[PDB]
Enzyme design. Sequence first.
Site, PDB file in Angstrom:
ATOM      1  N   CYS A 149      -7.084  -1.603  -6.534  1.00  0.00           N
ATOM      2  CA  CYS A 149      -6.348  -1.889  -5.312  1.00  0.00           C
ATOM      3  C   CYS A 149      -7.260  -1.531  -4.151  1.00  0.00           C
ATOM      4  CB  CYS A 149      -5.015  -1.143  -5.279  1.00  0.00           C
ATOM      5  SG  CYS A 149      -5.117   0.538  -5.925  1.00  0.00           S
ATOM      6  N   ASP A 158       0.828  -1.201   0.000  1.00  0.00           N
ATOM      7  CA  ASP A 158       0.000   0.000   0.000  1.00  0.00           C
ATOM      8  C   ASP A 158       0.867   1.258   0.000  1.00  0.00           C
ATOM      9  OD1 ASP A 158      -2.884   1.047   0.485  1.00  0.00           O
ATOM     10  OD2 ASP A 158      -1.781   1.966   2.176  1.00  0.00           O
ATOM     11  N   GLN A 184       0.297   7.563  -6.974  1.00  0.00           N
ATOM     12  CA  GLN A 184       0.079   8.321  -5.750  1.00  0.00           C
ATOM     13  C   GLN A 184       1.353   8.769  -5.052  1.00  0.00           C
ATOM     14  OE1 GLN A 184      -3.020   5.810  -3.575  1.00  0.00           O
ATOM     15  NE2 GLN A 184      -3.698   7.884  -2.995  1.00  0.00           N
ATOM     16  N   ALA A 193      -8.020   2.013  -3.173  1.00  0.00           N
ATOM     17  CA  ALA A 193      -8.706   3.171  -3.729  1.00  0.00           C
ATOM     18  C   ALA A 193      -8.775   3.159  -5.258  1.00  0.00           C
ATOM     19  CB  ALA A 193      -8.013   4.458  -3.254  1.00  0.00           C
ATOM     20  N   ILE A 201      -6.306   3.802  -7.540  1.00  0.00           N
ATOM     21  CA  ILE A 201      -5.579   4.930  -8.186  1.00  0.00           C
ATOM     22  C   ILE A 201      -4.061   4.724  -8.156  1.00  0.00           C
ATOM     23  CG2 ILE A 201      -7.394   6.710  -8.061  1.00  0.00           C
ATOM     24  CD1 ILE A 201      -5.951   7.876  -5.666  1.00  0.00           C
ATOM     25  N   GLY A 202      -3.475   4.406  -7.003  1.00  0.00           N
ATOM     26  CA  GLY A 202      -2.011   4.299  -6.847  1.00  0.00           C
ATOM     27  C   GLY A 202      -1.411   3.087  -7.517  1.00  0.00           C
ATOM     28  N   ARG A 203      -1.586   1.913  -6.923  1.00  0.00           N
ATOM     29  CA  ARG A 203      -1.051   0.678  -7.529  1.00  0.00           C
ATOM     30  C   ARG A 203      -1.749   0.451  -8.871  1.00  0.00           C
ATOM     31  NH1 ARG A 203      -1.404  -2.834  -2.067  1.00  0.00           N
ATOM     32  NH2 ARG A 203      -3.154  -1.398  -1.811  1.00  0.00           N
ATOM     33  N   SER A 204      -3.066   0.662  -8.914  1.00  0.00           N
ATOM     34  CA  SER A 204      -3.823   0.495 -10.153  1.00  0.00           C
ATOM     35  C   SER A 204      -3.284   1.405 -11.256  1.00  0.00           C
ATOM     36  CB  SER A 204      -5.311   0.770  -9.893  1.00  0.00           C
ATOM     37  OG  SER A 204      -5.841  -0.089  -8.884  1.00  0.00           O
TER      38      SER A 204
END
EC number: 3.1.3.48
Length: 297
Positions: free
Chosen positions: A214, A180, A261, A216, A218-221
Amino acid sequence: EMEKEFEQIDKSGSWAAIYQDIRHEASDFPCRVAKLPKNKNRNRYRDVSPFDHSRIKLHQEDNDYINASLIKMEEAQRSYILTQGPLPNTCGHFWEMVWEQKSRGVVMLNRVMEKGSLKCAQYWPQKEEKEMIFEDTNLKLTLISEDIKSYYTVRQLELENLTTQETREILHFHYATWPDFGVPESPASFLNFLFKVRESGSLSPEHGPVVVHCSAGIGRSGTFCLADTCLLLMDKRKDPSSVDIKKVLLEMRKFRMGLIQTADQLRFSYLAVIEGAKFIMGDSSVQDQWKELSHED
């Protein structure tokens, strides 16, 4: 050259600056539906919403809202759906979306529990003999088999629309070791996972957009989609130099806020695209090297 640009940013130590620049330029579109009071309990994070223009609409008359955006990459010719980790009350919406959008693959980049907190509902069955039924959307879901690797797992799922009795096979790609707000252990293990998804047929144009989430969404996705699209783009004209990573990211952020992110995730994206270029440019042997270096078993 992304490779040239990458080194200049490393030398000057300005990844935070570059990344802050992308945030400053990113698109800003209304998220009117997501903000409606009737949808509060459909959103996992107050600060991560889908834009109204790109959001996925459920084909129901009750409430068509789901926190999920269609990322349509026109030039690359690939679409993705980015969404949050389903909530306990939205798991039916999530599988209804999969059905109506005709998706063949679900890419999950997070674990159900991360950093001591529940980041995602347990929205798929962990035991063949205990299927799930989503009464609200009239869908049934059954685990058919698993292929458990050292850091990721591939599940074969059968999704049945209970109204028509039509069944569909869904592939679930579950990345287990991507922290995360962090980056994957290596470019090799990220690219090895990505090519497992590509080799399944899930990103093909004969199917619907692959669902990527993931916590939220946004980040890993964002990192996953940005690397794939950049690799697909240079595949198209076998021209690594035609790919501007920051421009692709900004084009993606037209369809969903906050993709990528942290500055380190941006930096990782470069690494992954740079490594994967080896495969795009005719060195097929690099795929096995990734598999080795990844230690999947």
